[PDB]
């Protein structure tokens, strides 16, 4: 009933494994070299749990490790265990573990334990009672009494925090393996292994494609492959090339490109907004690298957009400076000030009503996030005066950033005009031409010194003053 | 034994391939923070936690 036929997935059919594959072949060793494991006085760990984002191929990983193990494979949905009546689920898991026991050697797979692995006492109902009964039955089948060494369970959950502490107790679910989002090389391998089944060209550098689809799951890479199969009848070309995959990545990243009737002043307004955004984005190190700048309307966003990719390591670790945030608010204050510099204060539009709210939210978050230097951070107080004064600093930072944005914008009026003319004329601008116009019409942008230069100057100053103390002690003593 | 205890106390949480180019401006901040902690711990010693 719960048995499958025709399992042939191996480690070659799955891509982007890394050192996890090593752990995977450990399971193969657990299924092959087990006599040496047992002779060294070691109990076989029967519980492995794969945790990660959905779409990483948890079922594919289970199929691959089952095929490489060379044993019978069981894959069962956990939603079948939950029933409006109580009792059938415990019998189902008992019969499941029994047929797994008699089919030894074998490996079983149970996906989405979050339906049946919830805490006992979070919902008051008969369904919760059935869930508790099934959880206890699987608890007693896994470790409860002696008599199982050859059946190994495989678990695949997206939220490991809902797991019962009874299950993760040593002896039931001890091995925990995280399968993360693919980085760079995993995306190459997944795209290539999904693209073997389609005729493909030899000039196809997937590096740029994966450099566009940063931080996307393997199922999304399969989708990118899927938007590289049909759509070529409109032009009718010969072979799949780089630009087709680049456009497919652009489509799956933002949406379908649609053209509608429009006036000229609307295009001028949108291009002025995008021009302000890009011009202020140029003058800061936090978002200097600009790739695309367009004003074409898309699905869900009539307004234009800009693309920037600074290294994604500081955001994950949280090492962003205060100057990194105070600039960004200025960037989010780029559109409205441009309106004040182009149409007057009496004719402010309502297109920047979203970025201006982002600027004020970022200012409030920076104020109450400990980055403020009013007393020393201290985003919490007791008396009413200091709590009232907390919000005033957000307004002061907002006004300072708005004035800085206004000054920066007034510094670059010629670059403003040239890039806005190019935006209304071409509707899309790449990195090369935009940076060429920035070089032709830009002003001075003195970059503030980084951490290394400040460290070096402070180190030489410290050494010189400590050696000054050295002579002022020595020649005074000698 | 040390590695078994290390994996059993759950130090690792990302579970990803540990190969990342760390910038100098990150190692510098980490080293300065650790030096500050070391200096403040040596200057103000704790009787039970050396």
Curated annotation (Swiss-Prot), chain A:
Chief site of localization: plastid
Molecular-function GO term, any one: metalloendopeptidase activity
Signal sequence, renumbered to the chain: none
Keywords: ATP-binding, Chloroplast, Hydrolase, Membrane, Nucleotide-binding, Plastid, Protease, Transit peptide, Transmembrane, Transmembrane helix
Disruption of the gene: reported phenotype: Embryo defective.
An individual GO BP term: protein import into chloroplast stroma
UniProt subcellular location: Plastid, Chloroplast membrane
One GO location term (cellular component): chloroplast
Binding site residues for ATP: 52-59
Highest taxon of the lineage: Eukaryota
Membrane topology recorded in Swiss-Prot or TrEMBL: Multi-pass membrane protein
Cited function: Required for plastid development during embryogenesis. Might be involved in chaperone functions or play a structural role in the thylakoid FtsH complex.
Family affiliation: In the N-terminal section; belongs to the AAA ATPase family. In the C-terminal section; belongs to the peptidase M41 family.
Oligomer and partners: Homooligomer. Interacts with FtsHi4.
The protein's name in its UniProt record: Probable inactive ATP-dependent zinc metalloprotease FTSHI 2, chloroplastic
Native source organism of the sequence: Arabidopsis thaliana
Parent-record interval covered: 399 to 876 of 876
UniProtKB/Swiss-Prot annotation, chain B:
Gene deletion effect: Embryo defective. Impaired plastid biogenesis and thylakoid differentiation in embryo. Defects in the photosystem II protein complex formation.
Protein localization: Plastid, Chloroplast thylakoid membrane
Name by which UniProt lists this protein: Probable inactive ATP-dependent zinc metalloprotease FTSHI 4, chloroplastic
Entry's family note: Belongs to the AAA ATPase family.
Highest taxon listed in the record's lineage: Eukaryota
Function according to Swiss-Prot or TrEMBL: Functions in chloroplast biogenesis and chloroplast division. Required for plastid development during embryogenesis. Might be involved in chaperone functions or play a structural role in the thylakoid FtsH complex.
Tissue-specific expression: Ubiquitous but preferentially expressed in young leaves.
Assembly: Homooligomer. Interacts with FtsHi2.
Taxonomic path: Eukaryota, Viridiplantae, Streptophyta, Embryophyta, Tracheophyta
Section of the entire sequence shown: 555 to 604 of 855
